Design a protein around this nucleic acid. Sequence first.
DNA 1: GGGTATTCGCCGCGTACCTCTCCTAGCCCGCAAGTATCCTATTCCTTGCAGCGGT
DNA 2: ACCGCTGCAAGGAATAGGATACTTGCGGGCTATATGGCGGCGAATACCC
RNA 3: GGAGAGGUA
Lengths: 49, 252
Amino acid sequence: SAAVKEFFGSSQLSQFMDQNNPLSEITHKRRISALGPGGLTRERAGFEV
Amino acid sequence: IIERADHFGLAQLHQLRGRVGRSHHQAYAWLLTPHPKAMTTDAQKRLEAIASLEDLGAGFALATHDLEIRGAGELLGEEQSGSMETIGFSLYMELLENAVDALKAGREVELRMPSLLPDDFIPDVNTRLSFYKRIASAKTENELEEIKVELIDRFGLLPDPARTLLDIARLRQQAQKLGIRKLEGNEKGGVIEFAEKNHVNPAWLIGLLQKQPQHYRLDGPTRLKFIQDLSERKTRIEWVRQFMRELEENAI
DNA sequence: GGGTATTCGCCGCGTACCTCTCCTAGCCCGCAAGTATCCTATTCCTTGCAGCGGT
DNA sequence: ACCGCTGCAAGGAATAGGATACTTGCGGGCTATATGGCGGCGAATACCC
RNA sequence: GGAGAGGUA
């Protein structure tokens, strides 16, 4: 329970939903991030990425 | 001589000790116990208390110790011994006086199922008792309907115990006219105990017996055993209703 | 020894503001709440062998 | 003077409910193991003379 | 008060 609940409720990928548009929800759901666990960091990325 | 006195209340131990003597003679009272480390702590406490008090007239100090060690129970309810978070005496006297004053200016088809008016239905007791009297004394289905309408008007929805009580009153009213003195029922079946002079059509009764021998068997002069898997209270109620209805349609 | 090279580890990487969520794991101990055996009432019946009328 | 029948015993289970102690369910209230960033630099070794 | 996520110039 802890192992799963901690991840879903609090993780760097389960984020709030922008909802002030249908378009907002759609485009947000299709997002493709490169950060997170196992991913590079926002503030140490070179131009190539 | 108590062979194993560890598991006995203080009241029981004192009472047993009170059985010896009763005369001019000197009487002993041995309370044999197991090895003390095997005894439970409360057994040690009770034994040390009972052996602590060996005097004439000590039955009241012991009683007042058993109280305030086990505590007085629900003053208005059951569970005489124990804390039980009982209501206070000031509240009890107020409620008793209130009920008294309100009362002064006033003034079988058993089926092994609850058939009553639950407390959540009618809080005060006098109204409950009055409606019990009214339902039990009502001699017509019309008056039972009037009682039902009064109940719905004054308290709203009828709990299952209330509806079972009302339909049991109706069934008893029908059976009183018919002649079945005691109609019984349980989960497995039931017994019809007719009167000395019932109004059951003999030919139709024999027809029922010979069409369903398994469900109608005469065991005695007026005892008819029927076997039915009466799992549900509602289904039992309606099966009995239809049984008695088909009976009265053929009544002679 | 010593001048040189090579490695290793430390230090450093913009401002201001807005929205949101979430801040230890596990044990223990006492409360307290819910249960298996013992006597005196109750409703539940199903057998065993001798009398016994009656012929 | 033989026999099927009736009746007088025998044979006990299941609950109520006041006891006695077991069994535990719990909740508050405690204790106690990495793998996508470089750049610069100075200090610590390596080494081959 | 502190962390993390997102967002604006």
